[PDB]
């Protein structure tokens, strides 16, 4: 099973794990984000993903660093930094972040070299909605190219995670196709992370217009993603996703 060394905090993917979303978009903003990350840790998150973007590096650092510093001291959970900027990647890891969550899959100038030096795990996400002749084949080809580019830069394959990037330049039909064909992405030999949390495609499938109305559909999408091979799930609704996976694990355990 994949064993991820998140700067000393081990994340073991022997079973699907839960990555709690901590959005940090001022002391009162930092305070709210830290309290939320603590709530998600109590709800059974296996990892916290800290994001301060959607902006200049120094602004992104002002938001993310105090949250990383406080959460690394107050929780024993691995911490992920959601950024595509190499200067943020280096500074966040210096602050205590144990993983890089990169929507740009190390395509920003200097990201490859920055991460090669850090020895933390890295999520290689797909983001190009454009027309796809075959979204599954195109996402697979892109992810192969990024795995190889990371390996050529000196990043050990065992530090890699991949992600189809649900909702990034993808129609509802493209997202459903990627979820249904998720086992094809699991053949790249690297753990797959799926993030469908309260996303527009969940809302379109269920007719739920607002993010918080999409919890039931998101918990179901994440259970299906885990059934189809995903080993990490990026969610807002930690306790609910934990309960869904626990029930499924009990059923799956029956010989």
Ligand X SMILES: Nc1nc2ncc(CNc3ccc(C(=O)O)cc3)nc2c(=O)[nH]1
Note the residues at the interface with ligand X (CB under 6 A).
Answer: 82, 101, 103, 123, 125, 163, 165-168, 193, 195, 199-201, 234
How far is Cα 219 from Cα 4, in angstroms, rounded to an integer? 24
- When asked if residue 134 is in the footprint of a second copy (CB under 8 A), the reply is no
240 binds, among a second copy, ligand X, none (CB under 5 to 8 A by kind): a second copy
- Shortest Cβ 29–a second copy spacing (Å): 29
- Shortest Cβ 241–ligand X spacing (Å): 14
- Cβ atoms within 10 Å of 149's Cβ, excluding its own: 15
Name the nearest CA neighbour of 61 among 40, 83, 77. 83
- Mask: binding to a second copy, 90-129, rule CB under 8 A, as x and -? ----------------------------------------
| Active-site annotation, residues | 199, 234
- Shortest Cβ 184–ligand X spacing (Å): 18
Residues facing 161 on adjacent strands: 123
- Mask: binding to a second copy, 193-232, rule CB under 8 A, as x and -? ---------x--xx-x-----xxxx-xxx-xx--------
3-state secondary structure of 207: coil
User: Which is it for strands 122-125 and 99-102: parallel, antiparallel or unpaired?
Assistant: parallel
Q: Kindly report the CA angle at 102 between 145 and 41, in degrees rounded to 5? A: 135
Name the nearest CA neighbour of 61 among 72, 77, 50, 71. 50
- When asked if residue 171 is in the footprint of a second copy (CB under 8 A), the reply is no
Options 18, 177, 185, 235; binder of a second copy; rule CB under 8 A: 177
Q: Toward ligand X, which CB reaches closer, 49 or 95? A: 49
Name the nearest CA neighbour of 165 among 114, 213, 129, 134. 129
Question: Is there a contact between 180 and 151 (Cβ–Cβ < 8 Å)?
Answer: no
Q: Toward ligand X, which CB reaches closer, 27 or 206? A: 206
**SS3 helix, strand, coil % of the chain, rounded to 5?**
50, 15, 35
- Shortest Cβ 167–ligand X spacing (Å): 3
- Please give the residue ranges that form the binding site for a second copy (CB under 8 A): 176-177, 179-181, 202, 205-206, 208, 214-217, 219-221, 223-224, 237, 239-248, 250-254
């Amino acid at each position: 099973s994949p064993r991820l060394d998140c700067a000393g905090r081990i994340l073991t993917l022997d079973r699907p794990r839960v990555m709690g979303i901590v959005n940090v978009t001022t002391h009162t903003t930092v305070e709210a984000a830290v309290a939320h990350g603590l709530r998600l840790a109590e709800e059974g998150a296996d990892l916290l993903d800290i994001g301060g973007e959607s902006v200049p590096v120094e602004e992104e650092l002002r938001r993310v660093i105090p949250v990383i510093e406080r959460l690394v001291a107050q929780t024993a959970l691995p911490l992920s930094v959601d950024t595509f900027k190499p200067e943020v990647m280096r500074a966040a890891v210096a602050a205590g972040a144990g993983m890089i969550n990169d929507v740009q899959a190390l395509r920003q100038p200097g990201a490859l070299d920055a991460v090669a030096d850090l020895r933390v795990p890295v999520v290689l996400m797909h983001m190009p909605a454009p027309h796809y002749d075959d979204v599954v084949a195109e996402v697979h080809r892109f992810l192969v190219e990024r795995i190889f580019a990371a390996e050529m830069a000196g990043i050990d394959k065992r530090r890699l995670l991949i992600d189809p990037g649900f909702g990034f330049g993808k129609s509802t039909a493209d997202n459903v196709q990627l979820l249904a064909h998720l086992p094809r992405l699991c053949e790249l030999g690297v753990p797959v992370l799926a993030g469908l949390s309260r996303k527009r495609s969940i809302g379109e499938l269920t007719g739920r217009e607002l993010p918080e109305q999409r919890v039931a559909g998101s918990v179901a999408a994440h259970l299906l993603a885990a059934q189809r091979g995903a080993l990490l799930l990026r969610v807002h609704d930690v306790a609910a996703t934990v309960d869904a996976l626990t029930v499924w694990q009990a059923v799956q355990a029956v010989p």
